[PDB]
Scaffold this active site. Structure first.
Site, mmCIF file in Angstrom:
data_model
loop_
_atom_site.group_PDB
_atom_site.id
_atom_site.type_symbol
_atom_site.label_atom_id
_atom_site.label_comp_id
_atom_site.label_asym_id
_atom_site.label_seq_id
_atom_site.Cartn_x
_atom_site.Cartn_y
_atom_site.Cartn_z
ATOM 1 N N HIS A 41 29.774 31.507 30.920
ATOM 2 C CA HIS A 41 31.172 31.464 30.514
ATOM 3 C C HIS A 41 31.747 30.061 30.485
ATOM 4 O O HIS A 41 32.921 29.906 30.131
ATOM 5 C CB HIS A 41 32.018 32.420 31.378
ATOM 6 C CG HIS A 41 32.191 32.011 32.809
ATOM 7 N ND1 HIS A 41 31.411 32.527 33.822
ATOM 8 C CD2 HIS A 41 33.117 31.226 33.411
ATOM 9 C CE1 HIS A 41 31.817 32.039 34.986
ATOM 10 N NE2 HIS A 41 32.851 31.242 34.764
ATOM 11 N N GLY A 143 37.342 26.957 40.035
ATOM 12 C CA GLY A 143 36.455 25.831 39.866
ATOM 13 C C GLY A 143 35.144 25.941 40.613
ATOM 14 O O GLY A 143 34.275 25.082 40.426
ATOM 15 N N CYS A 145 32.896 28.525 40.395
ATOM 16 C CA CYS A 145 31.819 29.129 39.633
ATOM 17 C C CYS A 145 30.690 28.149 39.326
ATOM 18 O O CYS A 145 30.901 26.957 39.098
ATOM 19 C CB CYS A 145 32.464 29.836 38.429
ATOM 20 S SG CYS A 145 33.428 28.786 37.341
HETATM 21 C C1 LIG Z 1 34.908 29.760 37.230
HETATM 22 O O1 LIG Z 1 34.649 31.062 36.755
HETATM 23 C C2 LIG Z 1 35.222 29.994 38.725
HETATM 24 O O2 LIG Z 1 35.693 29.167 39.422
HETATM 25 N N1 LIG Z 1 34.893 31.308 39.235
HETATM 26 C C3 LIG Z 1 34.934 31.613 40.651
HETATM 27 C C4 LIG Z 1 36.229 31.856 41.384
HETATM 28 N N2 LIG Z 1 36.154 32.271 42.689
HETATM 29 C C5 LIG Z 1 37.505 32.443 43.232
HETATM 30 C C6 LIG Z 1 38.466 32.124 42.260
HETATM 31 S S1 LIG Z 1 37.764 31.680 40.872
HETATM 32 C C7 LIG Z 1 36.006 29.211 36.403
HETATM 33 N N3 LIG Z 1 37.138 30.132 36.406
HETATM 34 C C8 LIG Z 1 38.369 29.946 37.151
HETATM 35 O O3 LIG Z 1 38.605 29.023 37.858
HETATM 36 C C9 LIG Z 1 39.416 31.033 37.017
HETATM 37 C C10 LIG Z 1 40.721 30.420 36.524
HETATM 38 O O4 LIG Z 1 40.468 29.896 35.251
HETATM 39 C C11 LIG Z 1 41.575 29.246 34.677
HETATM 40 N N4 LIG Z 1 39.066 32.141 36.137
HETATM 41 C C12 LIG Z 1 38.266 33.237 36.649
HETATM 42 O O5 LIG Z 1 37.848 33.183 37.768
HETATM 43 C C13 LIG Z 1 38.025 34.454 35.758
HETATM 44 N N5 LIG Z 1 38.024 35.614 36.618
HETATM 45 C C14 LIG Z 1 38.746 36.844 36.368
HETATM 46 O O6 LIG Z 1 39.419 36.992 35.390
HETATM 47 C C15 LIG Z 1 38.539 37.947 37.407
HETATM 48 C C16 LIG Z 1 39.740 38.888 37.460
HETATM 49 C C17 LIG Z 1 39.426 40.069 38.361
HETATM 50 C C18 LIG Z 1 38.108 40.767 38.028
HETATM 51 F F1 LIG Z 1 37.836 41.696 38.966
HETATM 52 F F2 LIG Z 1 38.228 41.415 36.835
HETATM 53 C C19 LIG Z 1 36.917 39.828 37.880
HETATM 54 C C20 LIG Z 1 37.251 38.658 36.982
HETATM 55 C C21 LIG Z 1 36.701 34.401 35.011
HETATM 56 C C22 LIG Z 1 35.513 34.552 35.963
HETATM 57 C C23 LIG Z 1 34.194 34.573 35.184
HETATM 58 C C24 LIG Z 1 34.179 35.628 34.084
HETATM 59 C C25 LIG Z 1 35.378 35.514 33.141
HETATM 60 C C26 LIG Z 1 36.712 35.456 33.898
HETATM 61 C C27 LIG Z 1 36.307 27.739 36.593
HETATM 62 C C28 LIG Z 1 36.324 27.573 35.092
HETATM 63 C C29 LIG Z 1 35.576 28.885 34.996
#
Ligand SMILES: *[C@@](O)(C(=O)NCc1nccs1)C1(NC(=O)[C@@H](COC)NC(=O)[C@H](NC(=O)C2CCC(F)(F)CC2)C2CCCCC2)CCC1
Ligand SMILES: *[C@@](O)(C(=O)NCc1nccs1)C1(NC(=O)[C@@H](COC)NC(=O)[C@H](NC(=O)C2CCC(F)(F)CC2)C2CCCCC2)CCC1
Lengths: 304, 305
Positions: A41, A143, A145
């Site tokens: 992603h 951030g 991920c």
């Molecule tokens: C990255 O995915 C990340 O940091 N993921 C891990 C996290 N752990 C705790 C908080 S975030 C990135 N994404 C983000 O930082 C974050 C904000 O982006 C502006 N976005 C997300 O984490 C999305 N997650 C969701 O929408 C959740 C909502 C609840 C759920 F149960 F449905 C599961 C998804 C993305 C995660 C990956 C898949 C797409 C959505 C840092 C840049 C990417």
């Protein structure tokens, strides 16, 4: 003596962490030989993640669209391929810090160290267990991920987890390094929730052996039980059913202490029925279930 | 979200760990530039450690008596001197991966990461607090002496602890990197025991703030208290007296949550007097006291190194 939740030294993994950026999306990647592994992603805007078609989104990307930085040094991507939920970015430079490594898919109850990272840089390290509902209870912010989970054995780093996301109950979901998600989760902002979770019985028993080895023995009752009778009680407390395979992996701890597994099961049965009576075990007022039998063995023997 | 006992990344310290062997005694040393720092009792046989004359034992030793190994590469010792309980072995090769570093002495309540090591090889990493009785509650076996504790403060590794020994109650004692022992302890097999200890109140309050930041609210109440009225209660539960300095260092957490420190003190008072309602806070059924206020800030804001 002493028993602590103990992470593996993180330096070997630190040497593999990089930052990967596609347009407005920045996350962490894992640099091994001349491949950088990261969550697919990274190719999505936040709007794309509402309903992504990864195959189509990746057609739209060139190698130049991927900015990979190892520190402040840019690594040139020379190819990109997708494997399940992981992107593999071929780069022009092999990581000279590549450890000996394996990719492994772990089982519920098994533990691993997480090196939590932001922008390719480490924040800290802690132990997690894969829960039976295929989530982990970590500490992750936006951030994070692409941060990875791993075990180290003598020379070899076994990578087993790549962080993807947080569910609304505040627990964490991700993939193995082949990009398959632990549990029934998808890399999309779509409704998904953790299933019911059990207590990891074999780990609670391992931790009771840890307590005995460290001189915390008040809960031993010198009685015994059968596997069938234990499981009838354990089921009432939402404990995982104990099998003979679990009995066998407790073998080294039963050997070291001379206490039969089923004797420890009788002690655990009494702890469940009676509680701890205001006492603690290894400093805890609850029964800890995120130490495996091997975690206990290797902490109590000082491996590497 | 989430809140875990979180150690600093250990790689900068791993690159500094070496093995030091004198005759029948092997332990761990810390290799920074051209000097290896290790417990002075490496020069002792186990018999010597019953009643060591360290100045005499040191002068009897030559550079050749010290074998120093960094992984597989032998480091030749070209000089030796002693500072308090730490031995400094000058070596012929400088560590090319020496981090920017400082030797610091920490105060009770402060935390650090321990890199537990054996034969110069790291085994694991975990957080410890320096207790008010100057012991730590770690995980250490024979051979772990010379393992270090540290913090990373922006761009600088601050070494604050070098492990020496275990007391009979199973808690752990050691020195700073200048060789001075935290607490009234000595590097000899002579009778010594941990004193009374308190619960680290400022850390419990920090952890309650961590819980609020992570979405807990059940233990919040509408009450507020004074420092003196809180300490009357804390005294009954063997909590460290809360000082105005403690209130001040909780400032950033009070700022982020909007919850005044003395409001959170009223929550802690009720938790102490009535219990935790059969509930867990951040996965704990007890009140946790080994997170500092800065530990909460660094974990909840994602500080990196
Ligand atoms: C990255 O995915 C990340 O940091 N993921 C891990 C996290 N752990 C705790 C908080 S975030 C990135 N994404 C983000 O930082 C974050 C904000 O982006 C502006 N976005 C997300 O984490 C999305 N997650 C969701 O929408 C959740 C909502 C609840 C759920 F149960 F449905 C599961 C998804 C993305 C995660 C990956 C898949 C797409 C959505 C840092 C840049 C990417
Ligand atoms: C090293 O000191 C070491 O490993 N220390 C740390 C430990 N943590 C947990 C267990 S040991 C070395 N010493 C040992 O491994 C060990 C066995 O040596 C054959 N010896 C000691 O730890 C001694 N400790 C004591 O005698 C205790 C007894 C109780 C006490 F309260 F009095 C405190 C001292 C030495 C510790 C250092 C000072 C001299 C005695 C590994 C080779 C050295």
């Amino acid at each position: 003596s002493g028993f602590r939740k103990m992470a593996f030294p993180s330096g070997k993994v630190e040497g593999c962490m990089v930052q990967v950026t596609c347009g407005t999306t920045t996350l962490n990647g894992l640099w091994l030989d001349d491949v950088v592994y990261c969550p697919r992603h990274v190719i999505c805007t936040s709007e794309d993640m509402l309903n992504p078609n990864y195959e189509d989104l990746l057609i739209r990307k060139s190698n130049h669209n991927f900015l990979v930085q190892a520190g402040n040094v840019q690594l040139r991507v020379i190819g990109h391929s997708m494997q399940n939920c992981v992107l593999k970015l071929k780069v022009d430079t092999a990581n000279p810090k590549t450890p000996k490594y394996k990719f492994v898919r772990i089982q519920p109850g098994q533990t691993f160290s997480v090196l939590a990272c932001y922008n390719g840089s480490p924040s800290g390290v802690y132990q997690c267990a894969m829960r039976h509902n295929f989530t982990i209870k970590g500490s992750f912010l936006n951030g994070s991920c692409g941060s990875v989970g791993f075990n180290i054995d003598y020379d070899c780093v076994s990578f087993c987890y790549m962080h993807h996301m947080e569910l609304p109950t505040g627990v964490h979901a991700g993939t193995d390094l082949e990009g398959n998600f632990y549990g029934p989760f998808v890399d999309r902002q779509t409704a998904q929730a953790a299933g019911t979770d059990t207590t990891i019985t074999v780990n609670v028993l391992a931790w009771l052996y840890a307590a005995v080895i460290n001189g915390d023995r008040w809960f031993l009752n010198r009685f015994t039980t059968t596997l069938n009778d234990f499981n009838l009680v354990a089921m009432k407390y939402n404990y995982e059913p104990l099998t003979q395979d679990h009995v066998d992996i407790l073998g080294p701890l039963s050997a070291q202490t001379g206490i039969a597994v089923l004797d420890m099961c009788a002690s655990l049965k009494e702890l469940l029925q009676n509680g701890m009576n205001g006492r603690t075990i290894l400093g805890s007022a609850l029964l800890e279930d995120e130490f495996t039998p091997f975690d206990v063995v290797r902490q109590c023997s000082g491996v590497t």
